[PDB]
Swiss-Prot record, chain A:
Encoding gene per record: RPL11A
GO molecular function list: RNA binding; rRNA binding; structural constituent of ribosome
Organism, scientific name: Saccharomyces cerevisiae (strain ATCC 204508 / S288c)
Any GO CC annotation of this UniProt entry: cytosol
Matches recorded under NCBIfam families: PRK04219.1
Any GO BP annotation: ribosomal large subunit assembly
Name used for this protein in its record: Large ribosomal subunit protein uL5A
Keywords for this protein: Acetylation, Cytoplasm, Methylation, Nucleus, Ribonucleoprotein, Ribosomal protein, RNA-binding, rRNA-binding
Similarity comment: family membership: Belongs to the universal ribosomal protein uL5 family.
From Swiss-Prot, chain B:
UniProt source species: Saccharomyces cerevisiae (strain ATCC 204508 / S288c) (Baker's yeast)
Main subcellular localisation: nucleus
Intracellular or extracellular location(s): Nucleus, Nucleolus
Keywords noted in UniProt: Nucleus, Repeat, Ribosome biogenesis, WD repeat
Organismal lineage: Eukaryota, Fungi, Dikarya, Ascomycota, Saccharomycotina
Annotated stretches, region: Interaction with MDN1: 19-101
One GO cellular component, as annotated: nucleolus
Protein name in the entry: Ribosome assembly protein 4
Pfam families reported for this sequence: NLE, WD40
Function: Involved in ribosome biogenesis. Required for processing and efficient intra-nuclear transport of pre-60S ribosomal subunits. Interacts with the AAA-ATPase Midasin (MDN1/REA1), which is essential for the ATP-dependent dissociation of a group of nonribosomal factors from the pre-60S particle.
Listed SMART domains: WD40 (SM00320)
Subunit text: Associates with the pre-60S ribosomal particle. Interacts (via WD repeats) with uL18 (RPL5). Interacts (via UBL domain) with MDN1 (via VWFA/MIDAS domain). Interacts (via WD repeats) with NSA2.
Gene: RSA4
Record-level GO BP terms: protein-RNA complex remodeling; ribosomal large subunit assembly
PROSITE patterns documented for this protein: WD_REPEATS_1 (PS00678), WD_REPEATS_2 (PS50082), WD_REPEATS_REGION (PS50294)
Curated annotation (Swiss-Prot), chain C:
Compartments, record wording: Nucleus
Protein name per UniProt: Regulator of ribosome biosynthesis
Gene name linked to the record: RRS1
Loss of function: phenotype: Depletion causes defects in processing of pre- rRNA and assembly of ribosomal subunits.
Signal peptide: none
Function according to Swiss-Prot or TrEMBL: Required for ribosome biogenesis.
GO biological process: endonucleolytic cleavage in ITS1 to separate SSU-rRNA from 5.8S rRNA and LSU-rRNA from tricistronic rRNA transcript (SSU-rRNA, 5.8S rRNA, LSU-rRNA); ribosomal large subunit biogenesis; ribosomal large subunit export from nucleus
Family, as annotated: Belongs to the RRS1 family.
Gene Ontology cellular component terms for the protein in this record: nuclear periphery; nucleolus; nucleoplasm; preribosome, large subunit precursor
Quaternary structure, from the entry: Component of a hexameric 5S RNP precursor complex, composed of 5S RNA, RRS1, RPF2, RPL5, RPL11A/RPL11B and SYO1; this complex acts as a precursor for ribosome assembly.
Organism of derivation: Saccharomyces cerevisiae (strain ATCC 204508 / S288c) (Baker's yeast)
Positions of the UniProt region annotated as Disordered: 165-182
Keywords: Nucleus, Ribosome biogenesis
From Swiss-Prot, chain D:
Superkingdom per UniProt: Eukaryota
All residue ranges annotated as the Brix domain in the record: 20-235
Localisation: Nucleus, Nucleolus
The protein's name in its UniProt record: Ribosome biogenesis protein RPF2
Whole-protein residues included: 9 to 276 of 344
RNA sequence: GGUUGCGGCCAUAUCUACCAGAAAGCACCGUUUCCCGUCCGAUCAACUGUAGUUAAGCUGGUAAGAGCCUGACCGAGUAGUGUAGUGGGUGACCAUACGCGAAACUCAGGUGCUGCAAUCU
RNA sequence: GAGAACAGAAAUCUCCAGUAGAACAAAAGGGUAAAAGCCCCCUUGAUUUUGAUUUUCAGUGUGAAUACAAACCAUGAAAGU
């Protein structure tokens, strides 16, 4: 049965990791800003690596989370770029999914030669109503088995609205 | 913090012994008892065994045939109320209460901000303790909703300070005296200008007193009386908005005015002179009282608490018609008035000669008694509601209690550090609030003659106080801008 | 309704710990475990002692303050708390008395040449250029100017001072241990 | 840096002392009837109290070092060990220490006719007030075992000492009563532990001052049977009963005023 | 996978604790008033906010697990004449104005005590698990109690209209929230802008046909009514204890014997073992 | 009896995998003007009880489940051990006696009890 | 452990786990779990005044160190710490 345990999107999370910090970092930030309206967040490096040329607490990467209609627009707009064709992987066992594009111009958006090119990480995390149980402060709980999002149920959902193709074995 | 110093090695071993108990041995010795009223009558000899003071009511009430409970005293050397008999025949002194208990005012509600200046005056409504008006050194007055601790109509009109305010005893009209030249009558509910402002006095307004209800005809509004620094007094009619008769006996400024019991204005003035002023003569003087070596500040009457409230007793349960309001106004008056079955209103004055003279103006233009005691000037005087104790505020940081009937000294309240500006009573005639040049207000237990509770709160000088008639609530106002309300 | 309670023997009290010691003679077969009417006798016996304990306590003196509204560690005006005595009853203490009195070598010497120990005002020494005050030990020390500042005059000069501080810090933390021992 | 100093500041010695902290240990042979009585007895000594979950192998009169080991760890002078056996059924062993060393021991075996807070009618109370006390017996004064039991329960259940005391706090009373008088030679009688809540009434024959007190039971009802008893050494009494130390013809007046008699 | 040894090893948090509603760390501090300086009884106004509902509760502290002196509720307000806006701040303040009257009324001071007198009832406010923020409806209920003349110590701060960048309060802004005039203003906004949303929200009010300006005045009247009759009344009820019980047990599943379980296994080893 | 809120004991209350829930009450839920906080109305904040739903949470039931707890002459009067004997033995250590006396092991039963206030076909 | 373009043994995001191979100033042994770990907001401290320690040459109603107590200060809606 399903009335109302449907399959809404929790959130889209766009992400750009940068090898270096400086102009090229704050410009990647600026891309996520004007695309989201929201100010993005700068993750720091967790330890020093050396073969990547990075140090503990360097500021290495920006990202932004987007929820509700604006999420679905940028989803589909990027989803276009990927030919409406993902893979049999791409979907997690717990019923989320993601993809990338390279070149941030292939989905609206002009170029500007004083900004350069980046690409993006798209990641789409799914739920039903009552996911709040595992997220609110008061009466905090864990969601029961036959309410959990799965790979089967999300792929079926994807194959339907959007109309897109799965690919691979 | 300088301490109360510690108990000594012997004084511990005093305390460590078991002792005393309350006991009451039995107690049945047959000691003779006389009964006496503080008014006049002696009533003649019983001789029972010893009993609790609750029972000596029930012995009296069947004898006189009332059901009125009664307060008791004995040994008048001493003056102090088995509880007597441990101190050693007994002349028992009985006296009526008006049965009640107004509570000790302890806690603040948090400080109500508003107008951005010092607060000059602050009067409760008579009929309810929710409604309370304040006059500031900002040109606005403001009426506060006191249950919710918030402004009920921020009120505008004047173009200088507002020095005194008063609520009419029927409770229809508020009046606001000003540092310019004007009086503005207000409705509480609308908060709007009732016609044009009352203009007539040439300099600023000093105090405002209402014509009380039991004189005024049932289905006519009470007239206002207004004293001013030019020295005249005018009598304002609220409906027509025009003065009937200016009255111009005093040469210097009039410090305050009061409307009396029997159609008689009293006006305490800066020409060292107190003018008893009949209304029926249409602006005319009858008697001119002279004692003081300095000017006269303030003028208290025995009836003034009853005349201020006018019909609305502590419940605030309203009169259904003006003909009822006549009788309710007359009955609250005639609780206090007939003390020996005769309308003997006492008048009392303060002045900078450090002295209060006691007056009975209908009987004699001489004074009765000279209350002399204070070092620096007395400022406020107050009768207690029942006309029984007088108390007066002074600039030597101390408040002196004087018996009302004979102007005889009782005691002094000590506690205040800096100069005391004004005082007010609890309606039951037990507690007594006072305000100072320092932060603190204090409340004074009159029965034990002692400090009940100090209450700090304000950041600066505190000019005005008043106690609500029911006796939940006490207001305050002063130099730090914030109106604090105080409660149990 | 009757409050006062006679006994044969007087009761010996302890109003510090709040206790009433009763030496009056008990019956066996009242308090024997076979008895049906056992407990009401213990209630009847105790109620007397508790009444006698209270009838002392209410006849004590009591504090009655005039302070009110946030008496920040004390009582309101219209409480009225009862002034108890100390315990007569001698407990044993939890731990032995805190008296590990050594002299510690300095203070021996500071007796023999006194050296009245000092007025001890506060941290902040005065700097001249800068105009402002600035301590000393605390923050931006008159200790650590030489490390931060920019030229020295007359092998490095700064790290010699970073050594020669830590010698004196070692020396104090060493000179503890002998006085900790002895 | 200065957190776990304040542990050692509290755990160090002190002139005006803290509350003696209770520790209820389940032994090897504990059982559910005893585990109730533990908690019912603990509920009075709240807050100043700790319980274990585990069942520990201890034998007080054989070997003491685990008890000092627990006492020194937790900083808890009052210890109660729970044992049970066919000799000593429901054996509550009460221990106190002096500087993490054993002061005394006393074995109280609980009788079969105990009653718990669940059983009685449940009535008003407050968490961790001062109790009142009554001790019914001359033997409490005279006889050294009962002096030691008198020395226990006051030290156990009083909590914080104070100079100054409210009316409304005086809600309930502990009652210790020795089971009848006895002569030397005989068996030692039981000690009856009863707990009453007060109810005032307006008495008339007292008046306004003195009320009529009426007691009501709430429990826990316990009846203690005495076992083996380890007493302190006479020097250690002289150490333990010692004041902190903290004038002739010289008196403070009122107003301070250090006056001196000439004579 | 879990190692069976580990499942034994771990020690459960407090059963009530484990439950999200209630927190044991906070309780300890409320367990003892001080309690070293003096011995005193303790009263606390426990406030929780439940969906479609307002609840206010006041609880003695006791090793029994406590007793309640007074009980205040949103369903009472309809009896006082307010159906509407239970979730709103204004409604919470009324609950405070009301709770205090009933306890005072039962306590009997207006309308073992010795050496005087009435005494002033002091109640330390419960936190709950709610976050602390200025203009919280929790703190609205606190302010309600103050009209009642209950004393918890407080700040003007956590009311709405508290200026961050100066230590000041507006009583007019606080006055609006008591009435719910601010909520009424939003209704006015909805009336002027759109009516799709207006149908959806305040639909019950609209059935009443009450107006926002009038509602403020209606709210004012209700406060007055509460003071007049704060004693409380209990509903008479339809259907007994026993019926409610009986109808409930129609849908309440019930135990089994070892004997029944023994058959189920024997039955199982008959079927699922012996060669299909 | 069910349910909410507060709890006392703090696993007979938890964990793993399934199943059921009439009423009311919890709950999920809808909305971003107001006070408020976020990278984000997801958390928190406020507003409504309307558009919906028992799908979870929650509460019961189910299982020779995983654990935990109680009872016992199940193991066992066993180990350990105070005390006594010019007991034994080259020693290591162990019987005799007068007294106390565990735990695993093994079998049997159970799977949360209950204080206060309101509200339900 | 399972996923996401560039992206790899180590770059960030997301879901489920470590009863604590969390780091609790330390050392262990216990238990805090809406913490004492990590992150953000708000702020003096070697305060001043009096009984027990001890030292003075103007024995300086204590002048100053030291032990304790009380007012105060900080923070929080408070309980408090």
């Amino acid at each position: 049965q399903n009335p109302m345990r449907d399959l809404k999107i929790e959130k889209l999370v766009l992400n750009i990791s940068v090898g270096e910090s400086g102009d090229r970092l704050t410009r990647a930030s600026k891309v996520l800003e004007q695309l989201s309206g929201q100010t993005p967040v700068q993750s720091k490096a967790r330890y020093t690596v050396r073969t990547f040329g990075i140090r503990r607490n360097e500021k290495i990467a920006v990202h932004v989370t987007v929820r509700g209609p604006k999420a679905e627009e940028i989803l589909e707009r990027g989803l276009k770029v990927k030919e409406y064709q993902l893979r049999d992987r791409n979907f997690s066992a717990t019923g989320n999914f993601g993809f990338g594009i390279d070149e941030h111009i292939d989905l609206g958006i002009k170029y500007d030669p004083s900004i350069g090119i980046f690409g993006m990480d798209f990641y789409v995390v799914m739920n039903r109503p009552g996911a709040r149980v595992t997220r609110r402060k008061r009466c905090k709980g864990t969601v029961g088995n036959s309410h959990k999002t799965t790979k089967e149920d999300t792929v079926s959902w994807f194959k339907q609205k959007y109309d897109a193709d799965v690919l691979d074995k | 913090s300088t301490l109360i110093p510690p108990p000594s090695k012997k004084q511990k071993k005093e305390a460590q012994l078991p002792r005393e108990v309350a006991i009451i041995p039995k107690d049945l010795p047959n000691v003779s008892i006389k009964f006496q009223a503080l008014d006049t009558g002696d009533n003649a000899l019983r001789v029972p065994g010893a009993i609790s003071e609750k029972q000596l009511e029930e012995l009296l009430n069947q004898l006189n045939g009332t059901s009125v409970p009664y307060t008791f005293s004995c040994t008048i050397k001493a003056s102090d109320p088995y509880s007597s008999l441990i101190k050693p025949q007994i002349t028992l002194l009985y006296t009526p209460r008006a049965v009640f208990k107004v509570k000790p005012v302890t806690r603040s509600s948090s400080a109500i901000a508003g107008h951005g200046s010092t607060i000059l005056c602050s009067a409760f409504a008579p009929h309810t303790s929710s409604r309370m008006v304040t006059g500031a050194g900002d040109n606005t007055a403001r009426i506060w909703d006191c249950d919710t601790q918030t402004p009920m109509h921020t009120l505008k009109g004047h173009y200088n300070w507002v020095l005194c305010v008063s609520w009419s005893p029927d409770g229809e009209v508020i009046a606001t005296g000003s540092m310019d030249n004007t009086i503005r009558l207000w409705d509480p509910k609308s908060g709007q200008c009732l016609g044009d402002a009352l203009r007539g006095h040439s300099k600023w307004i000093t105090s405002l007193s209402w014509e009380p209800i039991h004189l005024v005809k049932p289905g006519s509004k009470p007239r206002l009386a207004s004293s001013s620094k030019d020295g005249t007094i005018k009598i304002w009619d609220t409906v027509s908005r025009v003065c009937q008769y200016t009255m111009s006996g005093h040469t210097n400024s009039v410090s305050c005015v009061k409307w009396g019991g029997q159609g008689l204005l009293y006006s305490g003035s800066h020409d060292r002179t107190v003018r008893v002023w009949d209304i029926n003569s249409q602006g005319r003087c009858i008697n001119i009282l002279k004692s003081h070596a300095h000017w006269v500040n303030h003028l208290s009457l025995s009836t003034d608490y009853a005349l201020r409230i006018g019909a609305f007793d502590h419940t605030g349960k309203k009169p259904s018609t003006p003909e009822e309001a006549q009788k309710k106004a007359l009955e609250n008056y005639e609780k206090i008035c007939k003390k020996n079955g005769n309308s003997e209103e006492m008048m009392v004055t303060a002045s900078d000669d450090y002295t209060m003279f006691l007056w009975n103006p209908l009987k004699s233009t001489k004074p009765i008694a000279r209350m002399t005691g204070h070092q620096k000037l007395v400022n406020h005087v107050a009768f207690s509601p029942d006309g029984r104790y007088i108390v007066s505020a002074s600039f030597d940081n101390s408040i002196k209690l004087w018996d009302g009937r004979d102007g005889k000294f009782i005691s002094t309240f000590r506690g205040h550090v800096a100069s005391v500006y004004q005082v007010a009573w609890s309606s039951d005639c037990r507690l007594l609030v006072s305000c100072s040049k320092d932060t603190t207000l204090k409340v004074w237990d009159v029965r034990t003659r002692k400090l009940s509770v100090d209450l700090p709160g304000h950041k600066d000088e505190v000019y005005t106080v008043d106690w609500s008639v029911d006796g939940k609530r006490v207001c305050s106002g002063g130099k730090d801008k914030m109106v604090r309300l105080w409660t149990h | 309704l009757p409050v006062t309670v006679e006994k044969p023997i007087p009761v010996v009290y302890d109003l510090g710990n709040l206790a009433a010691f009763d030496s009056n003679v008990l019956d066996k077969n009242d308090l024997d475990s076979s008895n049906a009417r056992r407990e009401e006798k213990i209630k009847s016996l105790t109620r007397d002692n508790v009444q006698l304990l209270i009838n002392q306590l209410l006849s004590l003196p009591m504090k009655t303050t005039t302070e009110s509204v946030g008496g920040t560690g004390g009582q309101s005006s219209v409480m009225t708390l009862l002034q108890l005595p100390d315990p007569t009853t001698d407990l044993p203490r939890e731990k032995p008395l805190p008296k590990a009195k050594a002299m510690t070598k300095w203070e021996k010497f500071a007796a023999k040449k006194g050296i009245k120990p000092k007025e001890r005002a506060g941290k902040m020494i005065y700097d001249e250029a800068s105009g402002e005050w600035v301590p000393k030990w605390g923050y931006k020390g008159a200790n650590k100017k030489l490390d931060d500042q920019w030229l020295v005059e007359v092998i490095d000069p700064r790290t010699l001072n970073r050594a020669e501080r830590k010698r004196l810090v070692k020396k104090n933390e060493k000179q503890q241990r002998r006085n900790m021992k002895n | 840096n200065a957190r776990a100093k304040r542990a050692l500041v509290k755990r160090e010695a002190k002139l005006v002392e803290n509350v003696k902290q209770a520790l209820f240990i389940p032994g090897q042979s504990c059982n559910k009837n005893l585990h109730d009585i533990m908690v019912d007895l603990s509920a009075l000594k709240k807050p100043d109290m700790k319980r274990f979950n585990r069942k520990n192998d201890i034998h007080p009169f054989e070997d003491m070092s685990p008890l000092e080991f627990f006492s020194e760890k937790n900083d808890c002078s009052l210890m109660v060990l729970m044992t049970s056996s066919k000799k000593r059924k429901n054996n509550m062993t009460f221990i106190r220490t002096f500087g993490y060393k054993i002061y005394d021991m006393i074995e109280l075996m609980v009788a079969d006719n105990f009653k718990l807070l669940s059983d009685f009618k449940k009535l008003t109370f407050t968490v961790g007030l001062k109790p009142m006390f009554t001790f019914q017996g001359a033997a409490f004064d005279t006889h050294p075992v009962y002096k030691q039991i008198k020395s226990l329960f006051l030290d156990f259940f009083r909590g914080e000492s104070t100079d100054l005391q409210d009316v409304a706090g005086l809600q309930h009373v502990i009652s210790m009563t020795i089971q009848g008088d006895f002569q030397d030679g005989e068996p030692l009688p039981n000690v009856l532990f009863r707990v009453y809540k007060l109810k005032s009434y307006k008495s008339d024959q007292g008046g306004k001052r003195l009320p009529r007190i009426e007691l009501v039971e709430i429990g826990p009802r316990l009846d203690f049977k005495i076992g083996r008893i380890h007493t302190p050494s006479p020097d250690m009494v002289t150490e333990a009963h010692k004041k902190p130390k903290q004038k002739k013809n010289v008196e403070l007046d009122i107003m301070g005023d250090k006056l001196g008699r000439i004579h | 996978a879990k190692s069976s040894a580990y499942s034994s090893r771990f020690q459960t948090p407090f059963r009530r604790r484990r439950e999200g509603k209630t927190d044991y760390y906070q309780r300890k501090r409320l367990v003892t008033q001080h309690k070293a300086k003096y011995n005193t009884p303790k009263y606390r106004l426990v406030v929780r906010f439940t969906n479609k509902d307002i609840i206010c509760q006041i609880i003695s502290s006791t090793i029994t697990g406590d007793v309640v002196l007074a009980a205040a509720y949103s369903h009472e307000l309809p009896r006082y004449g307010i159906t509407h806006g239970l979730t709103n701040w204004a409604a919470a303040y009324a609950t405070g104005l009301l709770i205090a009257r009933r306890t005072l009324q039962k306590l009997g001071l207006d309308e073992e005590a010795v050496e005087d007198g009435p005494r002033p009832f002091k109640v330390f406010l419960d936190i709950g698990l709610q976050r602390t923020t200025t203009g919280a409806r929790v703190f609205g209920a606190l302010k309600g109690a103050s009209d009642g003349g209950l004393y918890v110590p407080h700040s003007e701060n956590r009311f709405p209209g508290w200026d961050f960048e100066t230590e000041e309060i507006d009583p007019e802004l606080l006055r609006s929230y008591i009435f719910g005039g601010h909520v009424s203003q939003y209704m006015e906004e909805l009336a002027d802008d759109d009516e799709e949303r207006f149908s959806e929200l305040f639909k019950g009010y609209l059935a009443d046909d009450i107006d926002a300006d009038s509602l403020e005045d209606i709210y004012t009247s209700a406060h007055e009514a509460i003071r007049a009759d704060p004693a409380f009344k209990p509903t008479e009820k339809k259907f007994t204890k026993e019926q409610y019980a009986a109808e409930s047990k129609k849908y309440r599943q019930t135990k089994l014997s070892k004997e029944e379980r023994a058959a189920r296994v024997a039955a199982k080893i008959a079927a699922l073992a012996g060669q299909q």
